[PDB]
Amino acid sequence: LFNSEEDVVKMSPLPTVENQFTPTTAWSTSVGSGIGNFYSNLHPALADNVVYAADRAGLVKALNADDGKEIWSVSLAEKDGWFSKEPALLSGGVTVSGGHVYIGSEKAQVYALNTSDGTVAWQTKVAGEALSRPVVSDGLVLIHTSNGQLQALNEADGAVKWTVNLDMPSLSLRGESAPTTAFGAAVVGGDNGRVSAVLMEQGQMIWQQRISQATGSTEIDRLSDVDTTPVVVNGVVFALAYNGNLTALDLRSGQIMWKRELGSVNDFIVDGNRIYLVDQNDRVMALTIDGGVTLWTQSDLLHRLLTSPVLYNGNLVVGDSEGYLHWINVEDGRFVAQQKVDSSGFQTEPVAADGKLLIQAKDGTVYSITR
Amino acid sequence: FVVKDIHFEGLQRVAVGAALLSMPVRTGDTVNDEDISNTIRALFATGNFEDVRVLRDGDTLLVQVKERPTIASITFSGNKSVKDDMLKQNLEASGVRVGESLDRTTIADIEKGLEDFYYSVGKYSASVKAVVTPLPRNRVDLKLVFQEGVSAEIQQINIVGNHAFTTDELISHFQLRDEVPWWNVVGDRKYQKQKLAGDLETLRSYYLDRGYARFNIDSTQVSLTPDKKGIYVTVNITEGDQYKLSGVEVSGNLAGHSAEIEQLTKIEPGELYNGTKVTKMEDDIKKLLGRYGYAYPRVQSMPEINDADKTVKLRVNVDAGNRFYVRKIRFEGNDTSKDAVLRREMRQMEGAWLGSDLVDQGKERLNRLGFFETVDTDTQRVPGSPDQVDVVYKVKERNTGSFNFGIGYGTESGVSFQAGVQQDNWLGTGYAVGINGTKNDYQTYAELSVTNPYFTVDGVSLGGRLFYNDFQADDAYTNKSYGTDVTLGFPINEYNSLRAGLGYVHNSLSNMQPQVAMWRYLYSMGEHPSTSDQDNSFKTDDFTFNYGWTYNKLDRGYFPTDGSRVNLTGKVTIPGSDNEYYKVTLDTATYVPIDDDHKWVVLGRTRWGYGDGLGGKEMPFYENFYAGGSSTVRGFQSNTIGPKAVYFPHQASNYDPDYDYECATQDGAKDLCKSDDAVGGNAMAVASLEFITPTPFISDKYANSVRTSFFWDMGTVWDTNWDSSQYSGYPDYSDPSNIRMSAGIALQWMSPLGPLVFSYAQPFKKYDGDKAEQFQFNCGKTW
Amino acid sequence: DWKVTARACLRMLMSVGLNAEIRDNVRFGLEFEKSAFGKYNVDNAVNANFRYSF
Amino acid sequence: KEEVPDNPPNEIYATAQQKLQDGNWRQAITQLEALDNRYPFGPYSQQVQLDLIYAYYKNADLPLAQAAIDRFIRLNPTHPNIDYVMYMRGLTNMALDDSALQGFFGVDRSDRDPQHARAAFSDFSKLVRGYPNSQYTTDATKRLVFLKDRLAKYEYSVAEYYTERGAWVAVVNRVEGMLRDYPDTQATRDALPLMENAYRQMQMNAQAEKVAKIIAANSS
Amino acid sequence: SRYKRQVSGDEAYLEAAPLAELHAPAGMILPVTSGDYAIPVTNGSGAVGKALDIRPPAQPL
Amino acid sequence: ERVVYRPDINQGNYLTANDVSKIRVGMTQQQVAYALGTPLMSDPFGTNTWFYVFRQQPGHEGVTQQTLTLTFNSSGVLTNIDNKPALSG
């Protein structure tokens, strides 16, 4: 037993830097102790110059967006005991709609904290732990739990209106990809490749569709499942798979258009039919318009676990799992800029609202970043 | 077309007759191209080598297959966490094993077939690169290399849907662990699909013993994050409600035996449902019918849960065979082990009926025997008779035996040798003759146990033993004792025994300091040493007679929470010894639970054994009782509780060992040293009560392997008759009312390497002269 | 075959050590025992055994 | 091992045959299995299997040799010298018994799992009844006379613990199963006084007089 | 090296007690046998003991 | 009453009080094989007599035996059914 824990991939050696912007951080504020090592999406929201936060064990704050001072540091924890308490596992990005703040949890709970003082307005238990973001859609609070269910809560006070059941494989990847609104509908994703198009009012499924190939092996090589970000624009519906091509669907019929296989892992973004992705290897492949050219790609960030793109004024900002912030360009990205080393690792989706560039670390150290 | 000449050119490796018989065509047959296609199919199916071509122009059929290197010289690369033989037997049962003429269209196939095994082990990398180098004359040296990474780690096993019960207490009784600290080791973060189906079963078996009758697991999902390093598991419990037991009515087909079953199925009205008291009632009916001549008892029970009330009414049915005779016993697999030792460890007579519990409880004794690795069993029906069966056991030896040899260093005591061999299996029957040796710079120990456990074969043992001790040491005495002993092993029943036997020992001690505490042993027994010289010696010949009765009702493996255990030992030298005395030793370790939950218990252990000589002669000082240390009275130093010895002006100690001996040695105290380091008196009486509480405060996941406790120790060791003449300048040592209580706290700890016992006591009652010390972290305590 | 186990406690209540069995169940243990030879002294005698399981 | 330098020729089997006819098996076993591993198809491929079985047997090899024999029997069960391969297969089964201890031969081992003696008597009988005009037939009968007696002494030894335990049906069954399997051997005319101590122990004095009518008339 | 006695060959199986049949007395019957039974003599001139040369066939041609 | 150790010793053919009472004269050698079970000891000394012995040694100081001995004639018919429910001492 000389030494265990070897390595196989030996990710990128972090090549040189060509700084031309020198981006700085205006302020920073720690929020409790974050997830640390548990894989769960948790990004900070933003409303009228007030950026919120969250935590997997405790408090959820409402720090200012210009100074960084607390407004209401509610605990939202459980009861106590002899000399210790038990934490409330929270997951799912924070969502803001008016004066409500919905936060899912891993104990089948959905908190509805207020923005005034942080007092919970209503609470209703669901089936299965919540791992997706609560999606506000004309009142409905549709949430994709980690059980293949699409329960759509009400906004006023609980009132679970309707749930839709989806298939689940023997061993699935993740229960992400909460649905999105599309002309009064819900284009949800789902495991095992299937992508449903359930309705908004009651949930009558209009059509389903297969997204990729399977049967490569017993369980491992058929892990393909769309769980990233179902997006719709100009009638075309894209939805990123895990192993095969992404999507080419329609609102009404849903027939398969161009089926470019390039790009199959996480968080595609449409900004004028210029779809940037990462695919099973952390390379920024600026995908084509509709099939073919695949204009350009990157090779310096191979096997360095990155996050969702940010698109900060054209520049494709994206952070890796080591805490670096290598800026990219929009026409021919060759390391336009890069930031210093932010320790503790980056594993959450960086939010790109108007102005600031809030991003949460693996413990919670959100930084407003400018240049 | 009629073929006239069969043309086979080259005949590389396939036999000529095989090539002739593989072709459905011969000389003088009329066929078409379809039969040619069937011949191509046959050449493809024979699997030797298939580069074929067919040409038919005149009167002969020109079918020829080209040779190719398509042998099986597998070699393994530097795999890290996998044994070299597992992949060997895998490829043996599944392909490329020596021969078989592996083709080119199977490399990727075997690569995937081997990668799906690495996936099963739990290493989700599966990087295999297999190349084949061609050697002359149809030979290939296939070499495969592996590029594996770190395996998967069990992440949180958080459960959704559980009420009135914390999430951690449930996982406390689970097998798949998700948080292993350096504190202790109970499991490991390693995924096992077979182990999940046992955890999902023990969860139901644990949640059913409280009255929660309704129980249905909706779904159990298992997932993994991208860049797979962790695995998440989810369990969806649905509790429903709590119910109580109402009726245990029985009905079915019994041979007029309900009169004794209604006494085994009666229940108290109002009792809560118990998920493990029904499995026991079923096994208690499976035994009453088996004891009456029924081999395989079938018992089933369906609970009739009535809604709108807390009532469940079980209905039980039984049916148990006809006779199923078992008149045969065969043992196979044992080598160099007599058959006669295998038939004595089981309770199953040949020619009698079959009992489903006897043939299974015999396997337990065969396993507990010791020199066996795997003991299987099989019940086969003989042809003909429909009831007579044969039971056979398949055993495998373990190759018992050892040879210990150790050498020490210059450790301020001298070089120490050690040599021992027992092998525990002398010749077939199961004798345990062994020889030992602990040759230190002062010690000359040697063991000669020739024990025999089944003489007069009913369960009674009989064992002889010789020994030689030369413990040259100091007291302020160089001893040398050699002898032998032989005792038996009368077994009464389970958790009960009784030993009795004879003995003999000749002991000679010399170079001892004249302390008055032990200076009446010779003055009464013949001798009369002088008060000036010290070189005097003394030796006796003893004829001992030992006896005792054992009792161990612990009802637990190594963490007792109930029961008791008592043992006595004696020794009498009746007919011919130079010193007559008797010494008893009684001690108990009873446990008492305060409630119906094995978490709050209180135990109490006492020790006794007062013994004085008879016949006008005192008891030897080398057989006295010592008390103290972290074993009996925590808070005091090692075995220093008895009466303190004192000397007189006998300072001729013959060139004092320079601080090895003190307190009126050659250069010690001239007058009345008033020694410390007491010597234990004949009498002894200690007792200690101890509460046990759950450990505050750690997570409930691993809060069942600490077992902190609050104890309260006390005891006394006095001498029944010290003196009463003019010795009024020292504290009286004959008063038994000299107890020294010492309470504190004890902290057991099952470390990743064995158990340890931590205890910080505090003696709050002591008299003049007491060696006090704390923080005694003694380990190895498992009794 | 290096297969150390590093056992600790499986008169001495001491001797943390290892078990270096390689070929034929022959070990190379190195115990660190600390025994009481008199009444109150536990000093020394670290040692190493052979453990030939013939 | 060793790098045996066989260019093509049988000059590599010549030195192996010389070492086999030299009282040295362990060194000549690799020299045979190498030629077997690399050329098990040509003219020097039939004799190599027999010469390798003979080298594995004289080297006291484990069931690997039995497997090598069962492989020679499976491929080509037709040979004018086939009676030797069955004799060797029976010989390994017979030799797989005599251990009697860890490393010594001092005690009469006759009651230690006699499953290999029954796995050799069958093959020896099939050999002696199939080809009765061979040259290894005279020793087969002389070996069966001892092998069947050895099973008789195992039956007599397993029918003795039950007569002292107190179960007088098991010894009756084991002597009934011995009087119809090995009647004319030893350890069978001595178990008759052991069936009489049971028939008389169950109040059958009207049925033990028949046993004490063969004991007193069919023996000394 | 646990089996070294019956490898080089020895006269241990030889000089065994012969197989004498058992003749039932007049009036009673014996438990007739089947299965394990010594085949007829089938005598010849083969060597027994250590004189028989345990060797593979000559060439074998 | 030396109470040290004596395991339960039972020897074959567990009989009852409702199974023996069905045997009558001359039915066959077949219904007797399925009414009580196959016999444990026969008489190979040239006769069809079957021995149904029910003997047990329960615990300490106890031996009970029941020697149900019946003999069938040549080719079937039973003629000499005999029952012994007491251990003659």
Residue numbers in the entry:
A (entry chain B): 22 to 392
B (entry chain A): 24 to 499, 504 to 810
C (entry chain G): 1218 to 1227, 1257 to 1300
D (entry chain D): 24 to 243
E (entry chain C): 29 to 89
F (entry chain E): 24 to 112
Reported in the publication:
In Gram-negative bacteria, the biogenesis of β-barrel outer membrane proteins is mediated by the β-barrel assembly machinery (BAM). The composition of BAM varies by species with only BamA, an OMP itself, being fully conserved across all Gram-negative bacteria.
Alternatively, we developed a dual expression system to purify a crosslinked BAM/MBP-EspP complex directly from bacterial membranes. We used our low resolution structure as a guide to design disulfide crosslinks between β16 of BamA and β9 of EspP using a construct of MBP-EspP containing only the last four strands of the barrel domain (EspPβ9–12). Loop 5 is mostly disordered, although appears to curl inward towards the lumen of the BamA barrel domain. The first strand of the barrel of BamA pairs with the last strand of EspP, supporting the notion that the exposed edge of the first strand of BamA serves to initiate strand templating of the barrel of EspP. Our studies here, along with other recent reports, allow us to propose a revised mechanistic model where BAM is in a metastable state (outward-open) in the membrane initially and is pushed to an active state (inward-open) by initial interaction with the substrate and pairing of its β-signal with the first strand of BamA.
